[PDB]
């Protein structure tokens, strides 16, 4: 059963989709759920979009991340067209051609954070923590809510360094535990490409 969500759209563009969903009897919602099957992204001609929360979750959920052109060209062609040839090809940050969305729906047997325990620590800005934790959960990780509450499986500390007011503070997590401390972008890039990226580029140096 088709359940749809929109991202990156102007109000008049949303109105098109609302009309299109009404014609074909497809559920369109404002909030992304587990029940949601399709995330409809605004892209350019190259099927390249921007990174939104809905975009990340669409990949992490293994959902049909689809360009909004799939709506407009199906309006023009009068029939409801195939999702395969309208799936988004990548994003403005990580790559115009990484088939992130395709590789996520393809590999659900293997999920990118298969054996990791992830704890978010300290302040966070634009993305709700409970959402980023869900995204991490969606790629088959374990969410830990306290630094002491870690458990033959690997721990990772996730931090957003530009949210900290006393910037000397995010080098002090190595004192509390011996687990690695990466930036928030490690999660975000890894979900976007749907490949677990090597922590080396994201690793925050800790104080001895």
């Amino acid at each position: 059963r088709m359940s749809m969500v929109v991202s990156g759209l102007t109000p008049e563009e949303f109105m098109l989709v609302y009309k299109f969903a009404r014609k074909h009897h497809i559920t369109l919602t404002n909030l992304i759920t587990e029940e949601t099957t399709h995330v409809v992204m605004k892209t350019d001609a190259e099927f390249v979009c921007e990174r939104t929360l809905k975009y990340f979750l669409g990949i992490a959920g293994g959902k049909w991340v689809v360009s909004y052109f799939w709506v407009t060209q199906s309006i023009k062609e009068r029939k409801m067209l195939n999702e395969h040839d309208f799936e988004v090809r990548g994003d403005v940050v990580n790559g115009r051609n990484h088939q992130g969305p395709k590789r996520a729906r393809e590999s659900q047997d293997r999920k990118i954070f298969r054996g990791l325990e992830i704890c978010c620590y300290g302040p966070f800005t634009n993305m709700p923590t409970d959402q980023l934790e869900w995204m991490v959960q969606l790629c088959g990780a374990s969410v830990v809510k306290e630094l002491s509450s870690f458990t033959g499986v690997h721990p990772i500390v996730v931090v957003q360094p530009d949210a900290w007011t006393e910037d000397n503070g995010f080098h002090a997590i190595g004192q509390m535990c011996e687990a690695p401390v990466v930036t928030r972008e490690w999660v975000l890039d890894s979900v976007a490409l749907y490949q677990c990226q090597e922590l080396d580029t994201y690793l925050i140096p800790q104080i001895p």
């Binding site: 109000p11 008049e12 939104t52 929360l53 990340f56 403005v92 975000l188």
Partner: peptide, 14 residues
Amino acid sequence: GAAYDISQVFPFAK
């Protein structure tokens, strides 16, 4: 058109 709120983008960052 009028005043509409807009969902976050996640640009390049360290």
